[PDB]
Design a binder for this molecule. Structure first.
Ligand SMILES: CCCCCCCCCCCCC/C=C/[C@@H](O)[C@@H](N)COP(=O)(O)O
Lengths: 57, 338, 236, 225, 278
């Protein structure tokens, strides 16, 4: 019963995936936005770095 | 019994979908609606790395953000000094069919792999003064599509056998095997804490895997075709997948379902490689149309285009300090962008 | 492991000629540039000649320019030094030194044993100053070795080209610190290099019996490489 | 110059690496790339032994001062669309088809091996990557095919075959069916050779086909064609 | 006074010619932009084709300048300006024919050594490119250095009443050598292709023969009348041959050869056409 064993394994994997705690999309989106705004200054690709200190000029 | 198992599986999938829908009240497009748009992104080519004679398939930057490694079908793995375009090293590969390469965080080792189903680790810091094959890892029954270094002794590889592997380099044996993907696993990304990793496969799904336990933490199914690239967010709580249906998708682990889709009408070609900036605000995706788009991850709008390559942009990378973006295409030229 | 063996030294009549050969084993000779450096019987080190990998670039010291010729045979892994019209100032022990140059490399990793040659009896160059000739030291203590340069060794690329060497009694010099900050491979973490501009220091913490020797300060900014006078340590 | 002594030596090392890369590229550019393809038990192994006598397996041989590399993908249990672009630009594709499996239905199914072989030939020949790459079609096992068609009509594989059960006519018919799958009639050419396990002219035919491909490529390079 | 004396001694339609010439300029500009726009054309073959297009463009410019400056306004010209104009047309035509020679030489070298991938050897490329201009400029500059009819009025040409017959003889000899080289190289290319095709057993040869015949026939038919006049002027004394006065049509044929050259070098090249429509 290889097919039966595979189906049981898939069902167990799905059940184990269904027992995790999920937060709402609003909270996760807010966290991601907050992370983006917090690290915006340290991003030299968003703001063009001056040519004085960049390594390629 | 098989029919009962299948109906139990579909009931569990329905419960999964209902739970995901319940924890979905505000769309990421609605939350990131009043924020200031990034605007037009103008990145110019600063360095052009010449010396490869065949199409380039892989590239990895490294922690120092100065050296980099490139793999091409001509059989040469070239370590460049990106600042001065100097070739620090040129390793002749035993197999010319290479489509993945990684540079160790310490910098003492470099990895490569391809159609030979073997992951080759080369020692860069040798007393003899040359570069030798430190180790060869075998056991995958399909082509090696990606490989990433955890440390000097542990590596994580993805293959076309619908299976990922975690190898201990010193022993050379598979410490852990991650199975559950239905299609060819084409890319993997490592979390910043190196405790979890996401793998995208050809089954139009991505899987979040626990490195220590070896179990599949999560499974995300949003795409409609083969997923060719994947990359964690800088915070490690989310990831982005580029696929063959000309769309990118941002998923979040805590939410467990898809957040955003990045697509535009005049794009019908698949995505070969994706990468994030240092802050994660910009998502860079290389396409088949010889270009490399730069999307605003929060706003899903197009921010820029990196059109400087005469062939398909196969590999994409961003320095750990976000200083520059390196693109390797099939025209045998790497280009650094700022 | 890697080794360099010098041969061809001996007593020669002044005004004659002599050929010295350095045989290299254990490493890729063709990928390493090679230096010849003398040391006088009772004086410090002194750079003599240099040949790059592939013999593309060749340099000589102003004292030896014209009279000496440096060459390399990569297929048989040998470094040749032909010396014509030898003067009384050339009596010294010669070392062949391997040196590979790339980003993050450590030049002057390995020194040969050296061969002794004894014959019968400037300006525009950076002078490296080590005023301290010798100080007594106690094992387990901390000592600092100071170095001075006439011209700043810091380049526009951020690299301070200063190398630190230690010569134990009866042994060839070995590299401790390269580029003023980085420790050479196999060197205990006791040694620490510092300094900036024209003044430099080398710090030794909890030194032991085999740290006794002569410490040399060498620059690599302008290619007429110059060593310091030497600062030797003695136990009490 | 602004460069330091160490920087100058690093640049010299980079120049030496460049010259070694150029030498390696010149050595590799004068070498023929052949991609070996075929269905299960088509006869790729026999072709490999014939070439040798006169993941991915690479066979290196030499004929008439030409160095040939043959890439037998073989045991690559993965999607061909994910790694077949790596072989774009090979000099030629050597496709092996076993004639004798025209009436054998054990595909792995209820469809014969020959239909699967024609499906694979259609996929490779009309692939977007191999639009200009010529196909070298090897119809192996001619003797066993000739012995089989004595009592097994080709109607089992081709129900519209009204020709006689003779070796020459049936072989020509099968060749025509494979050649009609070539939609790229003008950009590429299919070279057909009927081989078996007891012949030695296969390497000569491959050399002639590669010579013709090289002549055509030179004519295209000069704009003379 | 020298030009009047020479025209006395030697015995010495435009709009349509200028229109046909402007057609050559437009066609050469189209071919050049086709070469530049397409990235896959950055190869030595298409570089030689672009050199040929540029040479034809310069030939058209020179012929238009001549036609505007010919007629009754050539007397107003100083003899130095006459020398510069004629050396202009001569340097423009020699560069075109030398571009044909360079194309033939590169094709012959490519066919002699098959290889597999035609490497972008730039040393030979630049040597041929530089030669096709250096020898052209030198040959066009000989008459102004002193090789002309001053103090040699009795030995002056009639079609060009200021250029010495010796200069025209040297130019004719150079043209003979150059045309023979082109013809021999193309015939030899066909010979190698035919023999190497025959030596293999299981077309391209027929298409190559058609292309070679087209190129050679067009070039020979265009330059034959200019050739026969450039010989007959030396072979005929002044004040005798009336046919030399109507030399405008032969030089129209010679320049419409440069006009036709892009058509020949594009129509025969299938990839060139496929890039040309799009
Ligand atoms: C060696 C390479 C090829 C050599 C090229 C030689 C070809 C000869 C170019 C001849 C230039 C013709 C231009 C002038 C012709 C004249 O007859 C009139 N325009 C001027 O006098 P008018 O007609 O006004 O009385």
């Amino acid at each position: 019963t290889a097919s039966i064993a595979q189906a049981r394994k898939l069902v167990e994997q799905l059940k184990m995936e269904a027992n995790i705690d999920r937060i709402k999309v609003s909270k996760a989106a807010a966290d991601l936005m907050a992370y983006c705004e917090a690290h915006a200054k340290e991003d030299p690709l968003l703001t063009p770095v001056p040519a004085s200190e960049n390594p390629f000029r | 019994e098989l029919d009962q198992l299948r109906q139990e599986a579909e009931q569990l999938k329905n419960q999964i979908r209902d739970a995901r829908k319940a924890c979905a009240d505000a769309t990421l497009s609605q939350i990131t609606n009043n924020i200031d748009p990034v605007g037009r992104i103008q990145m110019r080519t600063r360095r052009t790395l010449r010396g490869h004679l065949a199409k380039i398939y892989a590239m990895h930057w490294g922690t120092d953000s100065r050296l980099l490694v490139s793999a091409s079908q001509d059989g040469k793995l070239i370590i460049w000094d990106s600042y001065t375009t100097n070739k620090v090293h040129a390793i002749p590969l035993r197999s010319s069919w290479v489509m993945t390469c990684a540079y160790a965080p310490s910098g003492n080792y470099v990895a490569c792999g391809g159609l030979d189903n073997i992951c080759s680790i080369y020692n860069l810091k040798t007393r003899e003064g040359n570069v030798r094959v430190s180790r060869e890892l075998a056991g995958h029954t399909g082509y090696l599509s990606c490989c990433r270094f955890l440390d000097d002794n542990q590596i994580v590889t993805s293959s076309g056998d619908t299976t990922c592997a975690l190898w201990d380099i010193e022993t050379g044996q598979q410490t852990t095997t991650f199975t559950g993907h239905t299609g060819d696993v084409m890319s993997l990304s490592l979390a910043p804490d190196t405790r979890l990793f996401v793998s995208g496969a050809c089954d139009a799904s991505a899987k979040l895997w626990d490195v220590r336990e070896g179990m599949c933490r999560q499974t995300f199914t949003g795409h409609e075709s083969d997923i060719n690239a994947i990359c964690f967010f800088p915070n490690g709580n989310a990831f982005a997948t580029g696929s063959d249906d000309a769309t990118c998708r941002l998923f979040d682990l805590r939410a467990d379902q898809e957040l955003m889709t990045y697509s535009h009408d005049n794009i019908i070609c698949g995505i070969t490689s994706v990468s994030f900036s240092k802050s994660g605000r910009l998502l860079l995706a290389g396409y088949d149309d010889f270009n490399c788009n730069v999307w605003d991850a929060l706003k899903a709008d197009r921010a820029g285009v990196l059109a400087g390559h005469d062939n398909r942009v196969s590999c994409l990378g961003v320095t750990d300090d976000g200083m520059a973006v390196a693109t390797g295409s099939w025209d045998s030229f790497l280009k650094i962008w700022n | 492991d890697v080794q360099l063996v010098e041969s061809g030294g001996g007593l020669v009549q002044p005004g004659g000629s002599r050929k010295l050969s350095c045989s290299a084993s254990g490493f890729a000779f063709s990928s390493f540039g090679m230096h010849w450096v003398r040391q006088a019987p009772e004086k410090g080190l002194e750079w003599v000649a240099y040949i790059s990998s592939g013999s593309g670039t060749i340099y000589y010291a102003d004292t030896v320019k014209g009279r000496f010729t440096i060459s390399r045979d990569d297929p048989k892994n040998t470094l040749f030094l032909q010396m014509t019209s030898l003067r009384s100032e050339d009596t010294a022990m010669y070392y062949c030194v391997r040196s590979i140059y790339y980003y993050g490399s450590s030049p002057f990793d390995f020194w040969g044993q050296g061969t002794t040659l004894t014959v019968s009896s400037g300006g525009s160059d950076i002078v490296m100053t080590q005023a301290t000739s010798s100080v007594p030291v106690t094992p387990g203590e901390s000592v600092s070795i100071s170095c001075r340069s006439s011209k700043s060794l810091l380049h526009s690329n951020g690299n301070t080209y200063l190398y630190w060497f230690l010569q134990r009694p009866g042994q060839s010099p070995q590299l401790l610190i390269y580029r003023m900050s980085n420790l050479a491979s196999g060197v205990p973490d006791r040694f620490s290099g510092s300094g900036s501009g024209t003044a430099f220091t080398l710090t030794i913490s909890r030194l032991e019996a085999e740290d006794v020797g002569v410490y040399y300060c060498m620059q690599h900014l302008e290619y007429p490489l110059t060593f310091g006078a030497g600062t030797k340590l003695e136990l009490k | 110059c602004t460069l330091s002594a160490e920087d100058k030596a690093a640049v010299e090392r980079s120049k030496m690496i460049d010259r070694n890369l150029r030498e390696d590229g010149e050595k590799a550019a004068r070498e023929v790339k052949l991609l070996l393809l075929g269905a299960g038990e088509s006869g790729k192994s026999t072709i490999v032994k014939q070439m040798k006598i006169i993941g991915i397996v690479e066979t290196h041989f030499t004929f008439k001062d030409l160095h040939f590399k043959m890439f037998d993908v073989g045991g690559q249990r993965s999607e061909r669309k994910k790694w077949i672009h790596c072989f774009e630009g090979v000099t030629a594709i050597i496709f092996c088809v076993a004639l004798s499996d025209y009436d054998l239905v054990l595909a792995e199914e209820e469809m014969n091996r020959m239909h699967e072989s024609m499906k694979l030939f259609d996929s490779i020949c009309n692939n977007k990557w191999f639009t200009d790459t010529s196909i070298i079609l090897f119809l192996n096992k001619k003797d066993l095919f000739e012995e089989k068609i004595k009592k097994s009509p080709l109607t089992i594989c081709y129900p519209e075959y009204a020709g006689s059960n003779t070796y020459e006519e049936a072989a020509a018919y099968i060749q025509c069916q494979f050649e009609d799958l070539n939609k790229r009639k003008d950009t590429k050419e299919i070279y057909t050779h009927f081989t078996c396990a007891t012949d030695t002219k296969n390497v000569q035919f491959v050399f002639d086909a590669v010579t013709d491909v090289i002549i055509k490529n030179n004519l295209k390079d000069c704009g003379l064609f | 006074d020298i030009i009047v004396r020479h025209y006395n001694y030697t015995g010495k339609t435009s709009v349509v010619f200028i229109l046909i010439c402007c057609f050559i300029i437009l066609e050469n500009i189209f071919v050049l932009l086709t070469i530049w726009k397409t990235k896959k054309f950055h190869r030595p073959m298409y570089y030689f084709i672009g050199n040929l297009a540029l040479s034809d463009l310069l030939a058209g410019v020179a012929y238009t300048a001549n036609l505007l400056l010919s007629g009754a306004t050539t007397y107003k010209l100083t003899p130095a300006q006459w020398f510069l104009r004629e050396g202009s047309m001569f340097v423009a035509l020699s560069a075109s024919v030398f571009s044909l020679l360079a194309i033939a030489i590169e094709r012959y070298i490519t066919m002699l050594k098959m290889k597999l991938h035609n490497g972008s050897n730039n040393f030979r490329l630049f040597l041929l490119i530089s030669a096709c201009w250096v020898i052209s400029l030198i040959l066009g500059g000989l008459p102004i250095m002193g090789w002309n009819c001053i103090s040699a009025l009795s030995s002056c040409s009639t079609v060009l009443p200021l250029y010495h017959k010796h200069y025209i003889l040297f130019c004719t000899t150079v043209f003979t050598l150059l045309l023979l080289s082109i013809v021999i190289l193309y015939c030899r290319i066909y010979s190698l292709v035919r023999t190497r095709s025959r030596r293999l057993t299981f077309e391209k040869s027929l298409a190559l023969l058609k292309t070679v015949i087209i190129v050679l026939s067009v070039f020979i038919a265009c330059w034959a009348p200019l050739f026969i006049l450039l010989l007959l002027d030396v072979g005929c004394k002044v004040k005798t041959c009336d046919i030399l006065f109507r030399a405008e049509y032969f030089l129209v044929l010679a320049v419409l050869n440069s006009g036709t050259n892009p058509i020949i070098y594009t129509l025969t090249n299938k990839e060139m056409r496929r890039a040309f429509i799009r």
